Design a protein around this nucleic acid. Structure first.
Ligand SMILES: [Mg+2]
Ligand SMILES: [Zn+2]
Ligand SMILES: [Zn+2]
Ligand SMILES: [Zn+2]
Ligand SMILES: [Zn+2]
Ligand SMILES: [Zn+2]
Lengths: 261, 157, 112, 48, 39, 23, 168, 150, 167, 56
RNA sequence: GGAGGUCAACAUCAAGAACUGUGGGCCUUUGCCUAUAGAACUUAUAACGAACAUGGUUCUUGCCUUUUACCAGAAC
RNA sequence: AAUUUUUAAGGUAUGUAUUUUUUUU
């Protein structure tokens, strides 16, 4: 409101600035068809995203609102959108008022209007399945934070809790020390997807702490969909949270029958 | 016939010198409209073309007004401006018709090409679209003709 | 030359002797059906410009087919000579065997 | 009398005809019949 | 031991298309387009 | 609607006709 | 219905075609399939292009084209027509120009083939060729008086276009 | 390979040797009337060769002809850097750009390319491989003699 | 090779194997370098220094670059360019400091031409071309037909050079 | 041959020529009949390139 | 309303020297006889084109390690 | 009294693995 409502989002990046196509010299010759560097061996293509957003600062009103297009600008989510007020998609972090209108179609396709696929993907990649509603996100490659290491999970946890916080709701967050993986569950489906695109290939710490200026260089961090929680602790809870939701969904379903008569 | 000064072409009639610089200011713009900036976005790529279609529209109105409004050029010179393709004859012929005076293009009135029905919403008066939007109170959704960039050819607006 | 006059006569006679007698209902032509759609649009232009344009067109077509097939070691120069850039293993060799459609087409563009 | 005005692009012949079995092994099955070179070269003091 | 050859139906149930993939053979080009009836 | 209403109304568009932007 | 096709600005085509020069973007995925799909028709575009060549008494012909809006191919859509006797006169007349100019100058140089090197990308029309004024064609002196009838309209591209009596 | 044609010729007499020059008048006439005029105006004479940029270019004669102002930019794609020793024009006021062996394409479209060196006297320029000075400037073949000394 | 003709291709790949073309070129350059290096006193030569040659220069037939470069104790009175065996020489035309030698090999055919015409045609061709980088506009182009065991040189000669390069 | 020895009669062996109408026609006709070849060939090559070859 | 359009659709263009419509008569409308109206375009040293290409199948051949690519005559 | 020129393929295999940021007990 005070942040998003009045403003029309400032253009994140000038047209001139946006990275060019043709990633540089992975291979001996460029392939015009598949845009890739053909002959030779790649040495990990992945890099840290030179761009990221400012959830409060860039968000604003746009032409998608007047149209009232449901779907969100993803190039906004990457903070890379060059259209800004002339973009035809919504710029902001999802709220429950906009989610409610999407709530019809959020099963077959994500918040950005990208159709889901049935089987997921080997490594749990970009978009999930329309078979399962997965609210749980996985973070990996904490080396995106780079070499600078933090004294305990407190630094990590709080940082992750801070960064993902702005991107929507949070049901819970668990970092693991033994394995460098932090599981994040937003309250809502749509929010989990918006965080995935926004936070992938990113760095960490504060704006100006330690090696931040050379931060751009590293491997970058994974943000992937997450497997079911195997421990019977949450496996009871996931199933218990399942049933209690199911009971809520019997009543409304006998209510529109109670309406039907 | 040809734009080029090929020896076959006839030297310009009398009144051409007075309007010659005014046309060239369109010409040197067009040379810069086609220079091929590299633009990644598909929404930008057609926005470049929208500069040509406009500069083509704007150069013909200039020749249209002089002769068919201000009557400021001879009919010899005008007939010579159509050969040399400084003006699009079939476009101007719509400008003389009733209802079509402010038209974009000959593509915007194509009945055939468009999927259902015809005639870009680009030809529909703003006064109306506001009203069918009024039923929904949504302040329409229309901005630019995908062929052109037009907003309201229809001659009321 | 007298041989030339004989050869030309031979061709002349073999045309006169077997005719062909065209196809009523052929009245449907490629371009006439092609201009009907949204996608093709019409204008004038100078001849040499259309020649240059078609050269660029052709070169892009053949590069996209070649690279599509996965052959980046074969290089089309701008005069439509298809040159290998490198020594090829047999698998390279068998995939880059390349038919008469591609080559005939390319030679035809070379004349143009 | 090759025509006066022509440029012919050199097209490199990159394929060597070296017989790959006789280059590696030093034995070729085909013998004196082999359609290829038989020339036998070896690398450059790689080993320590 | 050829044993059981190959059934047509499995080749007739393939999802290429009604026709083949759309390859145009040189012997399927229209020829002898008209029939001839007996008295 | 009325002719006067339209004639007055149009000049609102930024740039003459017809590429002039409404709003 | 059926309104005829709408002629356009050549500038539009030019921008299309030189835009599609460089494509590495994802936006071109359906404009590359159009390039491949267009390869089937290319040998016809070569036909129509090459049967409309200028002829020597022409400095330039301006011919209609029919282009794919993705810039995938460009067909020359005219067909040439000629009055048979007028055409024979033109070719015969140049003929005499050829013999007179062959006997005229002592050294006759001939163009090197190919004219342009393999690595030089084909030069654009609007930059290179468009600005220059054209060199004169062959014509023939043709006589001051005898030929007064034909001499005016002889070497025109289409010798008589606007004559109500002389031609359809 | 394909250069439109050399319509202007102005010989430079330096200390290190006599540098011939051929020019394209028609393709960039604005740059010509800055170049030749200052040779007629003599403001180039006694110029130190200033800044070499290895693999890039060498510079001299910095002062500006008109009102210490710029020049209308013009280019032709037929004229590119495929060679060493193309006379060139920097964005900064009235500055020659003399392309060294490395003849890069990136400084292209940073400059207005202007003229060549005659194939015979290119060797004298390669002697740069105590700056040179310009004693005397003769113009062998003028092109546009109107407005020149008039 | 003007055809396909595989048997000829195979014989000709035997005759040149283990980079014999390059080794002939390096071999002639080296012996010319020693012979010039022995005349430092007589011909008034400051230094004879053979350059660093691109690995492919030997068999690249479009462009060339000098191999051995020269420099004079003082200065040199050079002639017009002429053939190795021609006699009348007026040394008063040009004056230089550096000389260069190209050693250009060639493998001839039945239609090939005599070597002299090839050596002069390439000399004018390269030295007037903009692709080839030569140190100074005077030099000698030494050709050899490998197939015919024939040689010539078309250079700019100064007093004392022809009676060497002949011998 | 026919065009030369009618053209070059009384003058020269030289390169001067430029009566190109017969050859131009000959090539245009060759084109007239190789359009259906290249359309069938290239049609097959591309319809196989996108859609793969038949299994049967 | 006329003159036009390198505009479009539809119909037609190798047959007893070769087209249709109509009235009447025999048959009982096909078909036969008779009277009559109208026949644009293409045809006799034969044809829409004062022009001239390619492919397929089957025969007879020519090159000849086999297929492609080909030699050159015929019929369809 | 007049022929006629060239490119591919049957020869140097083929197959498997290999550059990855640590899915909650
Ligand atoms: Mg076999
Ligand atoms: Zn956006
Ligand atoms: Zn329009
Ligand atoms: Zn429109
Ligand atoms: Zn409009
Ligand atoms: Zn062997």
């Amino acid at each position: 409101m005070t942040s998003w409502r009045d403003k029309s989002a400032k253009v994140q990046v000038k047209e001139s600035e946006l990275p060019s196509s043709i990633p540089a010299q992975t291979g001996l010759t460029f392939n015009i068809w598949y845009n890739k560097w053909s002959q030779g061996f790649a040495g990990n293509t992945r890099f840290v995203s030179p761009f990221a957003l400012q959830p409060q600062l860039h968000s604003g009103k746009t032409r998608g609102d007047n149209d009232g297009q449901l779907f969100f600008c993803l190039f906004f989510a990457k903070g890379m959108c060059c259209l800004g007020p002339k973009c035809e998609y919504l710029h902001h972090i999802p709220d429950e008022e906009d989610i409610g209108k999407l709530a019809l179609r959020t099963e077959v396709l994500d918040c950005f209007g990208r159709e889901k696929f049935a089987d997921y993907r080997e490594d749990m990649g970009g978009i999930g399945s329309f078979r399962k509603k997965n609210k749980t996100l996985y973070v990996g490659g904490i080396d995106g934070a780079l070499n600078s290491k933090h004294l305990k999970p407190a630094q990590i946890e709080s940082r992750i809790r801070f960064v993902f916080s702005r991107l929507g709701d949070i049901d819970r967050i668990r970092y693991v020390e033994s394995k460098n993986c932090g599981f994040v569950k937003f309250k809502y489906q749509a929010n989990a997807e918006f965080a995935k695109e926004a936070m992938s290939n990113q760095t960490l710490l504060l704006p100006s702490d330690k090696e931040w200026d050379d931060r751009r260089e590293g491997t970058g961090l994974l943000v992937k969909w997450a497997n079911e929680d195997p421990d019977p602790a949450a496996q009871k809870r996931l199933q218990e949270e399942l049933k209690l939701e199911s009971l809520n969904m019997m009543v409304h379903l006998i209510n529109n029958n109670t309406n039907s008569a | 016939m040809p734009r080029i000064k090929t020896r076959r072409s006839k030297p310009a009639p009398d009144g051409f010198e007075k309007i010659k610089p005014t046309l060239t200011d369109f010409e040197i713009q067009l040379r810069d409209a086609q220079k091929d900036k590299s633009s990644k976005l598909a929404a930008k790529s057609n926005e470049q073309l929208w500069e040509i279609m406009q500069l083509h529209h704007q150069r013909s109105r200039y020749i249209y007004t002089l002769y068919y409004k201000r009557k400021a050029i001879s009919k010899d010179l005008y007939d010579w401006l159509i050969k040399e393709k400084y003006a699009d004859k079939l476009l101007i012929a719509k400008w003389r018709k009733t209802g079509y005076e402010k038209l974009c293009c000959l593509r915007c009135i194509q009945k055939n090409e468009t999927n259902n029905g015809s005639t870009c919403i680009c030809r529909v008066p703003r006064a109306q679209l506001e009203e069918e939007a009024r039923k929904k109170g949504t302040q329409v959704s229309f901005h630019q003709c995908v062929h052109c960039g037009c907003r309201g050819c229809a001659s009321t607006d | 030359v007298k041989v030339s006059y004989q050869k030309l006569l031979k061709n002349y006679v073999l045309n006169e002797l077997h005719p062909t007698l065209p196809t009523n209902h052929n009245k449907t032509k490629l371009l006439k059906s092609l201009k009907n759609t949204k996608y093709f649009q019409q204008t004038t232009i100078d001849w040499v410009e259309a020649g240059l344009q078609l050269c660029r067109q052709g070169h892009n077509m053949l590069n996209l087919l070649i690279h599509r097939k996965g052959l980046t070691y074969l290089h089309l120069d701008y005069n439509f000579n298809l040159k290998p850039t490198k020594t090829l293993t047999t698998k390279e060799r068998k995939k880059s065997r390349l038919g008469n459609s591609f080559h005939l087409m390319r030679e035809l563009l070379k004349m143009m | 009398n090759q025509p006066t005005n022509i440029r012919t692009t050199v097209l490199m012949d990159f394929q060597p005809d070296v017989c790959k079995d006789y280059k590696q092994t030093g034995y070729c099955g085909y013998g004196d019949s082999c359609k290829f070179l038989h020339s036998r070269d070896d690398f450059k003091t790689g080993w320590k | 031991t050829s044993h059981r050859p190959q059934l047509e139906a499995r080749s007739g149930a393939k999802a290429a298309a009604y026709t083949p993939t759309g390859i145009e053979h040189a012997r399927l080009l229209p020829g002898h387009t008209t029939l001839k009836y007996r008295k | 609607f009325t002719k006067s209403e339209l004639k007055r109304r149009r000049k609102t568009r930024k740039g003459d006709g017809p590429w002039g932007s409404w709003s | 219905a059926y309104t005829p096709k709408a002629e356009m600005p050549p500038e539009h085509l030019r921008k299309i075609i030189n835009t599609h020069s460089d494509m590495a973007s994802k936006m071109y995925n359906t404009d590359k399939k159009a390039f491949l799909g267009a390869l089937k028709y290319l040998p016809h575009a070569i036909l129509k292009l090459l049967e409309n060549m200028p002829h020597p008494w022409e400095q330039a012909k301006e011919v209609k084209v029919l282009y794919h809006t993705s810039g995938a191919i460009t067909f020359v859509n005219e067909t040439p027509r000629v009055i048979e006797p007028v055409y024979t006169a033109q070719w015969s007349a140049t003929w005499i120009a050829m013999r007179r100019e062959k006997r005229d100058r002592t050294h006759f140089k001939r163009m090197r083939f190919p004219p342009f090197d393999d690595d030089e990308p084909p030069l654009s029309y609007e930059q290179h060729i468009e600005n220059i004024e054209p060199l004169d064609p062959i014509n023939l002196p043709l006589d001051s008086q005898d030929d007064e009838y034909v001499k005016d309209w002889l070497y025109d591209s289409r010798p008589l276009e606007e004559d109500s009596k002389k031609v359809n | 390979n394909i250069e439109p044609q050399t319509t202007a010729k102005c010989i430079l007499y330096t200390t290190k040797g006599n540098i011939a020059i051929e020019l394209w008048a028609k393709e960039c006439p604005e740059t010509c009337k800055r170049f030749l005029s200052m040779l007629s105006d003599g403001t180039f004479t006694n110029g130190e060769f200033k800044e070499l940029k290895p693999t890039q270019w060498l510079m001299f004669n910095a002062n500006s002809t008109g009102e210490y102002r710029t020049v209308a930019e013009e280019k032709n794609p037929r004229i590119r850097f495929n060679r060493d020793g193309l006379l060139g024009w920097d964005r900064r006021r009235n500055t020659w750009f003399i392309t060294v062996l490395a003849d890069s394409k990136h400084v292209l479209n940073d400059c207005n390319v202007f003229g060549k060196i005659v194939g015979k006297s290119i060797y004298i320029f390669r002697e740069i491989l105590y700056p040179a000075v310009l004693k005397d400037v003769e113009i062998t073949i003028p092109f546009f003699e109107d407005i020149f000394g008039s | 090779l003007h055809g396909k003709i595989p048997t000829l291709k195979i014989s000709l790949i035997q005759i040149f194997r283990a980079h014999l073309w390059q080794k002939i070129h390096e071999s002639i350059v080296f012996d010319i370098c020693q012979i010039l290096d022995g005349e430092l006193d007589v011909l008034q030569i400051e230094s004879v220094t053979k350059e660093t040659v691109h690995p492919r220069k030997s068999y690249k037939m479009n462009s060339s670059a000098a191999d051995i470069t020269m420099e004079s104790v003082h200065e040199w009175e050079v002639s017009k360019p002429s053939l190795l065996h021609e006699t009348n020489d007026s040394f008063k035309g040009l004056i230089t400091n550096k000389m260069w030698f190209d050693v250009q090999l060639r493998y001839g055919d039945y239609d090939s031409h005599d070597i002299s015409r090839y050596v002069r045609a390439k000399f004018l061709d390269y030295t007037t071309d903009n692709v080839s980088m030569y140190p100074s506009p005077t030099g000698v182009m030494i050709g050899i037909d490998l197939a015919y065991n024939m040689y010539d040189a078309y250079g700019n000669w100064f007093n004392g050079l022809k009676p060497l390069i002949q011998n | 041959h026919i065009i030369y020895y009618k053209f070059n009669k009384n003058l020269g062996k030289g390169p001067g020529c430029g009566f190109w109408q017969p050859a131009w026609r000959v090539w245009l006709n060759f084109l007239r009949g190789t359009i259906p070849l290249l359309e069938r060939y290239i049609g097959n090559l591309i319809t196989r390139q996108f859609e793969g070859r038949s299994n049967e």
